[PDB]
Coordinates of C-alpha atoms (C1' of nucleotides) and ligand atoms in Angstrom, one line a residue:
Chain G
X3 CA 96.3 90.8 108.0
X4 CA 98.4 93.7 109.4
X5 CA 101.2 92.8 107.0
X6 CA 99.0 93.1 103.9
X7 CA 97.6 96.5 105.0
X8 CA 101.0 97.9 105.5
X9 CA 102.0 96.2 102.2
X10 CA 99.3 97.8 100.2
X11 CA 100.1 101.2 101.7
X12 CA 103.8 100.8 100.8
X13 CA 102.8 99.6 97.4
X14 CA 100.9 102.9 97.0
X15 CA 104.0 105.0 97.8
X16 CA 106.1 102.7 95.4
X17 CA 103.8 102.9 92.3
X18 CA 103.5 106.6 93.1
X19 CA 106.9 108.0 94.0
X20 CA 109.3 105.1 93.4
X21 CA 109.3 101.8 91.6
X22 CA 110.3 98.2 91.2
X23 CA 113.4 97.8 89.1
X24 CA 115.0 94.6 87.7
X25 CA 118.4 95.8 86.4
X26 CA 121.0 94.2 84.2
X27 CA 124.6 95.4 84.7
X28 CA 128.0 94.8 83.1
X29 CA 128.1 91.8 83.0
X30 CA 126.2 89.6 83.5
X31 CA 125.5 91.2 86.9
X32 CA 122.0 92.0 88.2
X33 CA 120.0 93.8 90.9
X34 CA 116.4 93.9 92.1
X35 CA 115.3 97.3 93.5
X36 CA 112.4 98.3 95.6
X37 CA 112.4 102.1 95.6
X38 CA 110.6 105.1 97.2
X39 CA 111.7 108.6 96.6
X40 CA 110.6 111.8 98.4
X41 CA 111.9 115.3 99.1
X42 CA 111.1 115.3 102.8
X43 CA 113.9 113.7 104.8
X44 CA 111.6 113.4 107.8
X45 CA 108.8 111.6 105.9
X46 CA 111.3 108.9 104.7
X47 CA 113.3 108.3 107.9
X48 CA 110.5 108.7 110.5
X49 CA 107.5 107.3 108.7
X50 CA 108.2 105.2 105.7
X51 CA 111.4 103.4 106.8
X52 CA 110.1 101.9 110.0
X53 CA 107.2 100.5 108.0
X54 CA 109.6 99.0 105.3
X55 CA 111.7 97.6 108.2
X56 CA 108.7 95.9 109.7
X57 CA 107.8 94.3 106.4
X58 CA 111.5 93.3 105.8
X59 CA 111.7 91.8 109.3
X60 CA 108.5 90.0 108.8
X61 CA 109.5 88.4 105.5
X62 CA 113.1 87.4 106.5
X63 CA 114.9 89.7 104.1
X64 CA 118.5 89.9 105.1
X65 CA 118.8 93.0 102.9
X66 CA 119.1 96.4 104.3
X67 CA 117.1 99.6 103.9
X68 CA 119.4 102.0 101.9
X69 CA 118.7 105.8 102.1
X70 CA 120.5 107.7 99.4
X71 CA 120.6 111.5 99.4
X72 CA 120.6 112.8 95.8
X73 CA 120.5 116.3 94.5
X74 CA 116.7 116.9 94.6
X75 CA 115.3 114.1 96.8
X76 CA 115.8 111.2 99.2
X77 CA 115.7 107.7 97.8
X78 CA 114.7 104.9 100.1
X79 CA 116.0 101.7 98.5
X80 CA 115.9 98.0 99.3
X81 CA 118.1 95.9 97.0
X82 CA 116.5 92.5 97.2
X83 CA 115.2 90.0 94.7
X84 CA 112.8 88.7 97.4
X85 CA 111.1 91.9 98.4
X86 CA 111.0 92.9 94.7
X87 CA 108.9 89.9 93.6
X88 CA 106.9 90.2 96.7
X89 CA 105.5 93.6 95.7
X90 CA 105.6 92.8 92.0
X91 CA 103.3 89.7 92.6
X92 CA 101.1 91.8 94.8
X93 CA 100.9 94.3 91.9
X94 CA 100.0 91.5 89.6
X95 CA 97.0 90.7 91.8
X96 CA 96.0 94.3 92.5
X97 CA 92.5 93.7 91.0
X98 CA 91.9 91.3 93.9
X99 CA 92.6 93.6 96.9
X100 CA 90.1 93.4 99.8
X101 CA 88.7 96.5 101.5
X102 CA 91.6 97.1 103.9
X103 CA 94.2 96.8 101.1
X104 CA 92.2 99.1 98.8
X105 CA 92.0 101.8 101.5
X106 CA 95.7 101.2 102.4
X107 CA 96.8 101.5 98.8
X108 CA 94.8 104.5 97.9
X109 CA 96.1 106.2 101.0
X110 CA 99.6 105.4 99.9
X111 CA 99.0 106.5 96.3
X112 CA 97.5 109.8 97.6
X113 CA 100.4 110.7 99.8
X114 CA 102.6 110.2 96.7
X115 CA 100.6 111.5 93.8
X116 CA 97.8 113.5 95.5
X117 CA 96.7 117.1 96.0
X118 CA 98.1 118.0 99.4
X119 CA 96.4 121.4 99.8
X120 CA 93.3 119.3 100.2
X121 CA 91.3 122.3 98.9
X122 CA 90.8 120.1 95.9
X123 CA 91.0 116.3 96.0
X124 CA 93.1 115.2 93.0
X125 CA 95.4 112.3 91.9
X126 CA 97.8 112.4 89.0
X127 CA 99.4 109.6 87.0
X128 CA 100.2 108.6 83.4
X129 CA 98.8 105.2 84.1
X130 CA 95.1 105.5 83.1
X131 CA 94.4 101.8 83.9
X132 CA 95.8 102.3 87.5
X133 CA 93.6 105.4 87.9
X134 CA 90.6 103.5 86.6
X135 CA 91.1 100.7 89.1
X136 CA 91.3 103.2 91.9
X137 CA 88.2 105.0 90.6
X138 CA 86.1 101.8 90.7
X139 CA 87.2 101.3 94.4
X140 CA 86.3 104.8 95.4
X141 CA 82.8 104.3 93.9
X142 CA 82.2 101.2 95.9
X143 CA 83.1 103.2 99.0
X144 CA 80.7 106.0 98.2
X145 CA 83.2 108.5 96.8
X146 CA 82.3 109.9 93.4
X147 CA 84.9 110.8 91.0
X148 CA 85.8 111.3 87.3
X149 CA 88.9 110.7 85.3
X150 CA 90.2 112.8 82.3
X151 CA 93.4 113.7 80.6
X152 CA 94.8 116.7 82.6
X153 CA 98.2 117.4 81.1
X154 CA 98.4 117.2 77.3
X155 CA 102.1 118.1 77.5
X156 CA 102.9 114.7 79.1
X157 CA 99.8 112.6 78.8
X158 CA 99.2 112.8 82.6
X159 CA 95.6 111.9 83.6
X160 CA 93.9 113.2 86.7
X161 CA 91.4 111.5 89.0
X162 CA 89.2 114.1 90.6
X163 CA 87.4 113.2 93.8
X164 CA 84.1 115.2 94.0
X165 CA 84.2 117.9 96.7
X166 CA 80.7 116.7 97.6
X167 CA 82.2 113.7 99.2
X168 CA 85.3 115.4 100.7
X169 CA 84.6 114.3 104.3
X170 CA 83.7 110.7 103.4
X171 CA 86.9 110.7 101.5
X172 CA 89.2 112.4 104.0
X173 CA 88.0 110.4 107.0
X174 CA 87.6 107.0 105.4
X175 CA 90.8 107.0 103.3
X176 CA 93.3 109.6 104.5
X177 CA 92.4 109.4 108.2
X178 CA 93.0 105.7 108.7
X179 CA 95.7 103.5 110.4
Chain B
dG22 C1' 77.1 135.4 93.4
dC23 C1' 78.8 131.1 94.8
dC24 C1' 80.4 126.3 94.4
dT25 C1' 82.3 122.6 91.6
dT26 C1' 85.2 121.1 88.3
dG27 C1' 87.7 121.2 83.5
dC28 C1' 91.7 124.0 81.4
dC29 C1' 96.3 124.9 81.2
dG30 C1' 101.3 126.7 82.1
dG31 C1' 105.5 126.7 85.8
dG32 C1' 109.1 124.1 87.3
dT33 C1' 110.6 121.0 91.1
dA34 C1' 109.9 116.7 93.2
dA35 C1' 110.0 113.0 91.6
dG36 C1' 111.4 108.6 88.9
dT37 C1' 115.0 105.7 85.8
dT38 C1' 119.2 103.5 84.8
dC39 C1' 124.0 104.2 84.4
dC40 C1' 128.7 103.2 87.2
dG41 C1' 132.0 100.9 90.2
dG42 C1' 132.2 97.9 94.1
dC43 C1' 131.8 93.2 96.6
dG44 C1' 130.2 88.7 97.4
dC45 C1' 128.3 83.7 96.3
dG46 C1' 128.7 78.5 94.5
Chain W
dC13 C1' 130.7 82.2 85.0
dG14 C1' 126.6 83.8 86.0
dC15 C1' 124.3 85.9 89.2
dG16 C1' 122.8 89.0 93.6
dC17 C1' 123.6 92.7 97.3
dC18 C1' 125.9 97.7 98.2
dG19 C1' 126.7 103.2 97.4
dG20 C1' 126.3 106.4 94.3
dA21 C1' 124.6 110.0 91.3
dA22 C1' 123.8 111.7 86.5
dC23 C1' 119.9 112.5 83.9
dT24 C1' 115.1 113.3 82.4
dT25 C1' 110.3 114.7 83.1
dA26 C1' 105.8 113.4 85.4
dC27 C1' 103.7 115.0 88.6
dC28 C1' 101.7 118.7 91.8
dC29 C1' 100.5 123.7 92.4
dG30 C1' 97.4 127.1 91.5
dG31 C1' 95.1 130.9 88.8
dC32 C1' 91.3 131.1 85.6
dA33 C1' 86.5 130.4 84.0
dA34 C1' 82.3 127.9 82.3
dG35 C1' 78.3 126.0 83.7
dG36 C1' 74.7 124.7 87.5
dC37 C1' 71.9 126.4 91.2
Ligands
MN18 MN1 104.5 108.7 89.9
MN19 MN1 105.0 111.6 92.3
MN20 MN1 104.9 112.9 95.4
MN21 MN1 91.7 117.9 77.1

DNA sequence: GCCTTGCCGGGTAAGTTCCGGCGCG
DNA sequence: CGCGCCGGAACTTACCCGGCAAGGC
């Protein structure tokens, strides 16, 4: 209930600004990574990490939250086969998210990939199918929107939330838990 | 004249996967 | 022997930002 909401939010940040990596090292070593990157140190240590910690505690993951400071950004990383599959399986069943999870995930995805000036309401991603899934959710919530190829340099698509529904958007999705 | 939204270029804030560790049965 | 958790960081580019303008009222 509370776990899955926080889960879908985190999944949003992950699919947005991180990822789920199954790596094969020399040899034959392996690792399973749950990753969120961000520039803001504060956002990652004060906001995201306590949420990942709760989820880790709640699923008995003996793994730790790593925070690696690279040149351009902070990488929050959990190295854990268990947490990995947890999100990956949730991702596999994304089309089945209930209302709480939908709002949670879109919130997460907006923080990552969204227009922060909020003068325009936009979401970027190369994954058209992902954006399409999000678009259908927004329609069932009374938030009109269109999708179209924004950046031909890189095949990045954009999801544009109609300014007509700005307030229904900002207070239903972004101003939640 | 004003509001909404598609267009399009700048470049940095993201993402992705190497490496060397260490530990487990 | 095969595999799973740490600590990095080099490397590439996919996101965001923001000015412009083409319609719609
Ligand atoms: Mn992304
Ligand atoms: Mn991003
Ligand atoms: Mn981002
Ligand atoms: Mn086009």
